[PDB]
Amino acid sequence: PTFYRQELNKTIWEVPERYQNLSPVGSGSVCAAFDTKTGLRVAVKKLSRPFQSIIHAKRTYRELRLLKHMKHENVIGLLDVFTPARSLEEFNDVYLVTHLMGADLNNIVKCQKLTDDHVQFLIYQILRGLKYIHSADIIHRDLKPSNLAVNEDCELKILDFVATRWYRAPEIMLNWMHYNQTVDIWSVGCIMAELLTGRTLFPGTDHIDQLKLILRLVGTPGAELLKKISSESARNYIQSLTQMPKMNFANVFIGANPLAVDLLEKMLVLDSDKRITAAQALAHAYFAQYHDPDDEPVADPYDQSFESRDLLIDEWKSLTYDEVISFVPPPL
Ligand SMILES: Cc1ccc(-n2nc(C(C)(C)C)cc2NC(=O)Nc2ccc(OCCN3CCOCC3)c3ccccc23)cc1
Ligand SMILES: Nc1ccc2c(NCc3cc(CC4CC4)co3)nc(-c3ccccc3)nc2c1
């Protein structure tokens, strides 16, 4: 494949001839383009200094390994990955190609009002994607409206591109080091609550103000949850806050679907051991119009053994180069 060059907002791009009409989108740096081989509008992300440090190199390998493995309708997939290099000695740029979506859920929630029917379809697609992601032993940790891309037909894709702490599970705020996958479910509840009211549910100014807003809704942790908190520092700070009662969500999300209020009651739970999972939430009556267990697939098992390895930069670079060369595009 022959490459061409052009500068687009300080960053120079070397892309194959198949990608035309490059247009800057945001900032790695992303460009919108047209793929003459497939006829699709695509998004091309150029990784910025992929091997500047051990942190960058392993991060580069992690993202390429993740995107190559994601093959689900509601999760961002990899259409192509290329580099202008002809060998490992000159391998310094990595480009990632995916579908071009219309916008993100952040634009829709602040520019449009969503019917309860639209909330069902949008939240169902998130939970459908989360079940696929969680089945591969992967936690997103960064779910928020700006990480969810939506088309004009309300088709949604999860990606990992508005404060993140507003959607962070409380066990992440207190820096618990043994949380589970339901930290994403807490984020879904905060997102679902925002689609129903148009307001951010927990607009905290800091980590402490975030927990104060959370406790005003969910109430004081009970004796069962207090038994399972290992940090004496956090366990004492929780016992230092005045006893807040748990608000009834029907009095908070008024005029909302009774099934929507019940699902939020199962998602916005402090005790992560009792928080509803992605698979269980798909079976909730709120998604009866869309739920189909035979069309909610799980993922092929994903090898994360590299995360426990301590390698050099050129070793991470060489491993990334192998994944670039071994990539097989999906058929049309
Ligand atoms: C270190 C690291 C590790 C993993 C990730 N990671 N994790 C995920 C999962 C969890 C959802 C599978 C996905 C990602 N990576 C991404 O979501 N990467 C991307 C974000 C935004 C983009 O372009 C946004 C612009 N948008 C594209 C499509 O919609 C229209 C415009 C991208 C464009 C092309 C290629 C990748 C993009 C990210 C970083
Ligand atoms: N088995 C479980 C189940 C839930 C746990 C958990 N849940 C999240 C949480 C929420 C809160 C409420 C704080 C706002 C006051 C405290 O912890 N935190 C923590 C935790 C929090 C801080 C430090 C160490 C552990 N451990 C949990 C163990």
Swiss-Prot record:
GO biological process: 3'-UTR-mediated mRNA stabilization; angiogenesis; apoptotic process; bone development; cartilage condensation; cell morphogenesis; cell surface receptor protein serine/threonine kinase signaling pathway; cell surface receptor signaling pathway
Pfam (any one): Pkinase
Assembly and binders: Component of a signaling complex containing at least AKAP13, PKN1, MAPK14, ZAK and MAP2K3. Within this complex, AKAP13 interacts directly with PKN1, which in turn recruits MAPK14, MAP2K3 and ZAK. Binds to a kinase interaction motif within the protein tyrosine phosphatase, PTPRR. This interaction retains MAPK14 in the cytoplasm and prevents nuclear accumulation. Interacts with SPAG9 and GADD45A. Interacts with CDC25B, CDC25C, DUSP1, DUSP10, DUSP16, NP60, SUPT20H and TAB1. Interacts with casein kinase II subunits CSNK2A1 and CSNK2B. Interacts with PPM1D.
PROSITE patterns named in the record: MAPK, PROTEIN_KINASE_ATP, PROTEIN_KINASE_DOM
Catalysed conversion reaction: L-seryl-[protein] + ATP = O-phospho-L-seryl-[protein] + ADP + H(+); L-threonyl-[protein] + ATP = O-phospho-L-threonyl-[protein] + ADP + H(+)
Residues of the active site: D160
Localization annotation: Cytoplasm; Nucleus
Broad enzyme group: transferase
Sites bearing Phosphothreonine, chain numbering: T11, T242
Outcome of swapping F306L: Emulation of the active state. Increase in activity
Native source organism of the sequence: Homo sapiens (Human)
Protein name: Mitogen-activated protein kinase 14
Activity modulation comment: Activated by cell stresses such as DNA damage, heat shock, osmotic shock, anisomycin and sodium arsenite, as well as pro-inflammatory stimuli such as bacterial lipopolysaccharide (LPS) and interleukin-1.
Underlying gene: MAPK14
InterPro entries hit by this protein: Kinase-like_dom_sf, MAP_kinase, MAP_kinase_CS, MAPK14, MAPK_p38-like, Prot_kinase_dom, Protein_kinase_ATP_BS
